[model samples]
Target: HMPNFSGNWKIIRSENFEELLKVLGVNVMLRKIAVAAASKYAVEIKQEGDTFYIKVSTTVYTTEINFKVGEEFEEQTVDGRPCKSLVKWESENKMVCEQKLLKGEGPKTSWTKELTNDGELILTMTADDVVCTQVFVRE
Candidate 1:
């Protein structure tokens, strides 16, 4: 079965976020500026058949990530690393995105977005060894 996640979600909690960013090899400057304030985090998702589009927005910065299921594409990190990425459905309600630096290996990152039975959004992010989890609710 295909997953449908077309909704607007707002983050209620973020855990081990700074550590995850550091583990992903994000530059010190970027990380520092990123974790400067504990502002709000939100995501807007559009699931269109085989294609998906997601926009991650903080109180200030916003980024776009869109890809087709089961296809590899060029993507960039917040730290500005060029990456080869793929998006796939791990289950009926779990969609995962995996990325690796196109230029060099190590510090691979993965983002797993799952819709819970309670209708909450659980986003688990992994960078090599570290993992961070964020909880969100539909808006």
Candidate 2:
């Protein structure tokens, strides 16, 4: 079976890790802590029939999202900002997220989740046409 990035994962290698956070509109102070804290995420997935409840937890942040295939949600980021987001499965091992937000509203971003053959989770984020990747490992 093809690997799926459907389990808990912790942040590993990132290019200009802190810089990426800054670009993501994270505050400078938060970036410092987030960069130094060895940020990791514990993701829990509960499938209730066709619906999925996904919860992600880090040391300082926690997020839970509920949806089924081709579901759209009006959600906010860590700090309570609002965004319109839609998630769809591209394949068993791949899922795509599309989000909409204004500049003053915050940074708008899109990403895909994929699991490598080596059992690694790779999240590729796109914003302003620039792409950045965050890699994760099983905790």
Candidate 3:
């Protein structure tokens, strides 16, 4: 049940990752660079039984994560803190990821999607309890 995620996705808009970084406790200088970097995701998903794994490659870093449909796993952060993550699907193509890390004083969460709008396929991410939103157009 590996996801065939080979497609083109473009960055449409965001609440701005820079502001989101600030909420995540990232320093100003580093946040500026991170926001400036061309952030894109080349994601590959592999699934076996009740477990799934996703590998995301971006301009700044690459990350691999493994999880069960309703189980929790430790997630290594690329920019902020180390977290333990849990994901549950709201639909076939929609999921919510909740993360809590000791490296940070608070928990952070994100929502994901493979959606279409205005005749373009896109990938969307929204940070929970905050005003951060990130959109990508599938190319």
lDDT per residue, candidate 3, 24-60, as tens digits?
A: 6789998877776636545555656557777666686
Instruction: Give one digit per residue, the lDDT tens place, for model 1 in 26-139.
Output: 778877777764347888999888788899888777889778989998878645688888888888889888887888766778878899988888899887788889999998
Candidate 1 residues lying further than 4 Å off, grouped into runs, are 1-3, 25-33, 36-38
Task: Indicate the TM-score of model 2.
Answer: 0.73
The sequence of per-residue lDDT tens digits that candidate 2 reaches over residues 29-136 is 987887666456556666554466777677877878887667777666434557777878786667788887633555567767776778887777665445667788
In model 3, the Cα lDDT at residue 124 comes to: 42
Best by TM-score: 1
Alpha carbon lDDT at 51, candidate 2: 64
Q: State which candidate has the highest lDDT.
A: 1
lDDT of each: 0.81, 0.68, 0.60
RMSD per model, one decimal: 2.7, 3.4, 3.6
